[PDB]
Amino acid sequence: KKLFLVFWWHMHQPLYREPYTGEYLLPWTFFHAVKDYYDMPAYLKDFEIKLNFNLTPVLIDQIQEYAQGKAKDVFLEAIRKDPDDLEKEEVEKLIEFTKLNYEKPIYRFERIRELMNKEKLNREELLDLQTLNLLAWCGRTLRKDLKDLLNKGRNYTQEEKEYVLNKYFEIIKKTLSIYREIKEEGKGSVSTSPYYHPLIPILLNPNCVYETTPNVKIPDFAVSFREDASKHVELAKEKYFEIFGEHPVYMWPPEASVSNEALELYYEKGINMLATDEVILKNSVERASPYLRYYFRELISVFFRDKTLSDLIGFSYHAWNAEDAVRDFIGRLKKIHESVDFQPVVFVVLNGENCWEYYEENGIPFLEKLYSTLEKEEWIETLTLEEAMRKEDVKTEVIESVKAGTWFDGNFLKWIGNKEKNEYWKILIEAKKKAKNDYILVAEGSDWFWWQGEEKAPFVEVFDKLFRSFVRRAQE
Numbered sequence: 001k002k003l004f005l006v007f008w009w010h011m012h013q014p015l016y017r018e019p020y021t022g023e024y025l026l027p028w029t030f031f032h033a034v035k036d037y038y039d040m041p042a043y044l045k046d047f048e049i050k051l052n053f054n055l056t057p058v059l060i061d062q063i064q065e066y067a068q069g070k071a072k073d074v075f076l077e078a079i080r081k082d083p084d085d086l087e088k089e090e091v092e093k094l095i096e097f098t099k100l101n102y103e104k105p106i107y108r109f110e111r112i113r114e115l116m117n118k119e120k121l122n123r124e125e126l127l128d129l130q131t132l133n134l135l136a137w138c139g140r141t142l143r144k145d146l147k148d149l150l151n152k153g154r155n156y157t158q159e160e161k162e163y164v165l166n167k168y169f170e171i172i173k174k175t176l177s178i179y180r181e182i183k184e185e186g187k188g189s190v191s192t193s194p195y196y197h198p199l200i201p202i203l204l205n206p207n208c209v210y211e212t213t214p215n216v217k218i219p220d221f222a223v224s225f226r227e228d229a230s231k232h233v234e235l236a237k238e239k240y241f242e243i244f245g246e247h248p249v250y251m252w253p254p255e256a257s258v259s260n261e262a263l264e265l266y267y268e269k270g271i272n273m274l275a276t277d278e279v280i281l282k283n284s285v286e287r288a289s290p291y292l293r294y295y296f297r298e299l300i301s302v303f304f305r306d307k308t309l310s311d312l313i314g315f316s317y318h319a320w321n322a323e324d325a326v327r328d329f330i331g332r333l334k335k336i337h338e339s340v341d342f343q344p345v346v347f348v349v350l351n352g353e354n355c356w357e358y359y360e361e362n363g364i365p366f367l368e369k370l371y372s373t374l375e376k377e378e379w380i381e382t383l384t385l386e387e388a389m390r391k392e393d394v395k396t397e398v399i400e401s402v403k404a405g406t407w408f409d410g411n412f413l414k415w416i417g418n419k420e421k422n423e424y425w426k427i428l429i430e431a432k433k434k435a436k437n438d439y440i441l442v443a444e445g446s447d448w449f450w451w452q453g454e455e456k457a458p459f460v461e462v463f464d465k466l467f468r469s470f471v472r473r474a475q476e
Ligand SMILES: OC[C@H]1O[C@H](O[C@H]2[C@H](O)[C@@H](O)[C@@H](O[C@H]3[C@H](O)[C@@H](O)[C@@H](O[C@H]4[C@H](O)[C@@H](O)[C@@H](O[C@H]5[C@H](O)[C@@H](O)[C@@H](O[C@H]6[C@H](O)[C@@H](O)[C@@H](O[C@H]7[C@H](O)[C@@H](O)[C@@H](O)O[C@@H]7CO)O[C@@H]6CO)O[C@@H]5CO)O[C@@H]4CO)O[C@@H]3CO)O[C@@H]2CO)[C@H](O)[C@@H](O)[C@@H]1O
Pocket: 010, 011, 012, 013, 014, 028, 032, 100, 255, 307, 310, 311, 314, 349, 350, 351, 353, 354, 407, 408, 409, 414, 446, 447, 450, 457, 458, 459, 460
């Protein structure tokens, strides 16, 4: 009797590229590409396990633009320049960015504490601030290769900074290749999401929000987004086809969001399997185990992720010692293994790039200990998505209906329902009436609504600038 374990790491960034200037207004795609997007699948070169990944098409687009050297990244140009060439605004942007990341474990360099406690910084000190911001986002592979510059910790030269930058772009240029390789070798499956990561159930039917939050206010949806919902899915299939030469058979619905209509659309578009959240299962079926493969109306296969285990990695284990975290994780899998007579399928689904910066050493001790332990546990078999989809020796169940929701409390309140988020929907609804190009799809991405009307921290104004720019461009 085995326990089947399925890791599914979701990778996404909204489009940071301003449509009129072409400038990347935030550097997050760059930093998560050099730190996480290559290195998470690159663990498969050192550990004989299966790991699966989701890549949104919008993220793939930006990775390609950086690998081709066409990405005009405003924050990165402030990093690359000789400090004597920096504009006063670029120095402020560099300091603000450091301050935003200052308490993250990956930013624990003593030299950073010194620089941020100085009244003014000379050229030598700015070069360290530039280079240490680069090095704090160093991924596992180059952490081994650049160890001597990393342990230097201070006194960086322009030449050393440009060397690091060169190695980072080498990593980005190999990123889509590593996904093709692990896919070809059978080390994992690769999925995508509808193109700009929208909330498909809302696009299809905005009233589905009342299935879980009857008291919420939503704007007057005076146009139909149903066709744009088909578009996100179709163009995502095209983009995945471009990269991997095959149409995607698995999809990760953005924010785990499903509804009866969304599942029908995924089915009509040829999708054979997706996953969603455990809260959706419990809202939809009176008594239901998340360790079975589910068939929605015998149309499409659905797995419901293990919310606890997914949340443990995504939010808890950063605060633990690495060995104890893995002992806890393994112990829970042993309890699942012993508690059922059949072979349970356990789905661990979370973002693949956002939790590691809060772990010691960028999550590397945790993941190396976790993956080394998993690979030696006889009774655990990690599975590609394809294997989990086609696995014969598992338990299965048909379900006929789901209550619409997301993995945020099983509802849509992260993206609609307050004055500020509803204003974005009003802006999109009016813009959709006058839309003339696919920038209307960019504006339908979940991220713009996620950040809206939530507390004001640095650079969240940039998301508002991007959303409104895409909405304006969509009408020209
Ligand atoms: O002050 C309080 C605030 O402080 C901190 O937040 C800071 C950050 O520290 C700072 O670095 C910066 O954040 C940056 C970020 O660093 C950049 O990378 C970028 O963020 C990107 C991100 O990298 C992308 O992956 C993408 O995020 C999507 C994501 O792909 C998508 O899957 C989804 O994921 C979230 C989901 O919506 C949430 O509900 C939740 O999901 C959990 C559920 O909550 C839970 O219930 C569980 O069961 O399951 C779910 C999954 O595990 O979290 C998910 C996060 O993965 O949505 C996100 C967002 O759309 O895109 C974003 C960009 O949109 O940019 C940001 C912004 O600059 O700035 C912030 C604020 O200053 C602290 O970390 C944070 O906790 C505090 O709120």
